[PDB]
Design a protein around this ligand. Structure first.
Ligand SMILES: C[C@H](CCC(=O)NCCC[N+](C)(C)C[C@H](O)CS(=O)(=O)O)[C@H]1CC[C@H]2[C@@H]3[C@H](O)C[C@@H]4C[C@H](O)CC[C@]4(C)[C@H]3C[C@H](O)[C@]12C
Ligand SMILES: C[C@H](CCC(=O)NCCC[N+](C)(C)C[C@H](O)CS(=O)(=O)O)[C@H]1CC[C@H]2[C@@H]3[C@H](O)C[C@@H]4C[C@H](O)CC[C@]4(C)[C@H]3C[C@H](O)[C@]12C
Ligand SMILES: C[C@H](CCC(=O)NCCC[N+](C)(C)C[C@H](O)CS(=O)(=O)O)[C@H]1CC[C@H]2[C@@H]3[C@H](O)C[C@@H]4C[C@H](O)CC[C@]4(C)[C@H]3C[C@H](O)[C@]12C
Ligand SMILES: C[C@H](CCC(=O)NCCC[N+](C)(C)C[C@H](O)CS(=O)(=O)O)[C@H]1CC[C@H]2[C@@H]3[C@H](O)C[C@@H]4C[C@H](O)CC[C@]4(C)[C@H]3C[C@H](O)[C@]12C
Ligand SMILES: C[C@H](CCC(=O)NCCC[N+](C)(C)CCCS(=O)(=O)[O-])[C@H]1CC[C@H]2[C@@H]3[C@H](O)C[C@@H]4C[C@H](O)CC[C@]4(C)[C@H]3C[C@H](O)[C@]12C
Ligand SMILES: Nc1ncnc2c1ncn2[C@@H]1O[C@H](CSCC[C@H](N)C(=O)O)[C@@H](O)[C@H]1O
Ligand code: SF4
Ligand SMILES: [Br-]
Ligand SMILES: [Br-]
Ligand SMILES: [Br-]
Ligand SMILES: [Br-]
Ligand SMILES: [Fe+3]
Ligand SMILES: [S]
Ligand SMILES: [S]
Length: 347
């Protein structure tokens, strides 16, 4: 089908595998731009003009896992490891709330030290501030997830990374797609708002793989979907592999919006890392969430999933004000509430 035909099918919501592969495979400028306009329009129609700010505190870069793409992988000995104390995390959280953050995201490598009781304590103290708490701590026992829910956690981000179980296993040798998926399913059952998502341009990943990621996201109707390009980190086995294409990743964001019109989709730090102004672009192509880095110095510079992360040289407190300005110059509006998913039931 031609680009015009694919758009009309997408507009009609005939989301066949073939329509999705063709969408990802056509490189025509005119087609891409129309696809971005569609997704921008569906975003506006379903989730409005509010850009939700999730203040992310990356509280530890310790990790027991060895994912091949990740600078925090345990085999990376060329990284200063840190752990924030629960007091520092709580007080850093409080500063974000004082700055107007309505969701706190606590993210870390898979660091056993905190698990589960110290996270429980931290979540309970943060929840007292009357904001949403989102956890992004990786794969843990059902029991841990349960304790964290009971402690007051609202949401959990656990990117599925890749729905190709063979590629998944090769890139994440400690675990599997089955395990990853089971965590997402457990999270959902426990009542978390859950986030999935994938990297784009992983070594060995094909367009068919990306289509499978879309159909997976659509299958499970995730509340949130984080998508970024793969960015090689020099202290990893994937150091000399090619970074993910910005445009292709932006197309995955657009199609995710089209497939899940009422989902919460961030313009991820990785998009802004590979293209100057990439998050702003992404916010105009389907995304409606931003997650300003609230990780304090001198730890911020040490949380290197991938290198070059923008926002590492600014003052600790700069990213909240910066994203507020961003939201305003994009002609958008800050989130007025916790910005949980607001389901519009359709056919
Ligand atoms: C109208 C204006 C004169 C010219 C000068 C610079 C041009 C932009 C840049 O080339 C970057 C980019 C290239 C893409 O291919 C198309 C989009 C972009 C944003 C262009 C749009 C437009 O063409 C611009 C603004
Ligand atoms: C600003 C920039 C250059 C425009 C220009 O200079 N002319 C004029 O009028 C008079 S004169 O002819 O220049 O004299 C234009 C050219 C193409 C535009 C993007 C595409 O649409 C895709 C996409 C659609 C979404 O909905 C919103 C986001 C996106 C990324 C757009 C943003 C922006 O809008 C772009 C970059
Ligand atoms: C200028 C910049 C490269 C900077 C550099 O490294 N040199 C390149 C890298 C990615 C490019 C955008 C994306 O393709 C999506 C979109 C496609 C539309 O067709 C036109 C607008 C958009 C925003 C593009 C504009 C521009 O062309 C970008 C920013
Ligand atoms: C203090 C800082 C400089 C400026 C730059 C952008 C400003 C925000 C935007 O103007 C939109 C809105 C008005 C109110 C809002 C949210 C502002 C807050 C504050 O005034 C900001 C952060
Ligand atoms: C933290 C300190 C000291 C006082 C304090 O501790 N303030 C708690 C505020 C609590 N809330 C954010 C929940 C207010 C919501 C009321 S509101 O009327 O905005 O809905 C106060 C003093 C002035 C405040 C900044 C300015 O104002 C400008 C700007 C407005 C944006 O908007 C949010 C970002 C920013 C940078 C503000 C951040 C923060 O806040 C500041 C630094
Ligand atoms: N090199 C890289 N390039 C782009 N994104 C990467 C990356 N390394 C890691 N990421 C992204 O960063 C996300 C958060 S990693 C931190 C959360 C937790 N350890 C977990 O694994 O889920 C990952 O899910 C991954 O998609
Ligand atoms: S992606 Fe998460 S689990 Fe994998 S090495 Fe990085 S921080 Fe650890
Ligand atoms: Br969130
Ligand atoms: Br465990
Ligand atoms: Br995300
Ligand atoms: Br990211
Ligand atoms: Fe910033
Ligand atoms: S930012
Ligand atoms: S920033």
């Amino acid at each position: 089908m031609t680009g015009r035909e694919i758009l009309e099918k997408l507009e009609r919501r005939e989301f066949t595998r073939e329509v999705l592969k063709e969408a990802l495979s056509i490189n025509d400028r005119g087609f891409n731009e129309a696809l971005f306009k569609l997704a921008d329009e569906i975003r506006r129609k379903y989730v409005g003009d509010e850009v939700h700010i999730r203040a992310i505190i990356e509280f530890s870069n310790v990790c027991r896992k060895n994912c091949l793409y990740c600078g925090l992988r345990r085999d990376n000995k060329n990284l200063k490891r840190y752990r924030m104390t629960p007091e520092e995390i709580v007080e850093r959280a409080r500063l974000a709330v004082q700055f107007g953050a309505k969701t706190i995201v606590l993210q870390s490598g898979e660091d056993p030290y905190x698990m589960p009781d110290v996270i429980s304590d931290i979540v309970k103290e943060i929840k007292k501030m009357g904001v949403a708490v989102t956890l992004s701590l990786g794969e843990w026992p059902r029991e841990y997830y349960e304790k964290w829910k009971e402690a007051g956690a609202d949401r959990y981000l656990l990117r599925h990374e890749t729905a190709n179980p063979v590629l998944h296993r090769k890139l994440r040798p400690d675990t599997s797609f089955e395990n990853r998926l089971n965590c997402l399913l457990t999270l959902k059952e426990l009542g978390y708002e859950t986030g999935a998502g994938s990297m784009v341009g992983l070594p060995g990943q094909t367009i068919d793989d990306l289509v499978d990621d879309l159909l997976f996201l659509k299958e499970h109707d995730f509340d949130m979907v984080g998508i970024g390009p793969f960015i090689p980190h020099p202290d990893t086995p994937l150091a000399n592999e090619k970074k993910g294409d910005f445009t292709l990743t932006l197309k995955m964001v657009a199609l995710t919006r089209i497939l899940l019109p009422d989902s919460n989709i961030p313009a991820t730090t990785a998009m802004g890392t590979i293209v100057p102004g990439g998050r702003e672009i992404t916010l105009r192509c389907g995304a409606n969430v931003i997650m300003p880095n609230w990780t304090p110095s001198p730890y911020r510079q040490l949380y290197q999933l991938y290198p070059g992360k923008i926002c590492v040289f600014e003052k600790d407190t700069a990213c909240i004000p910066c994203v507020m300005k961003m939201i305003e110059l994009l002609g958008r509006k800050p989130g007025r509430d916790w910005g949980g998913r607001k389901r519009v039931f359709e056919t």
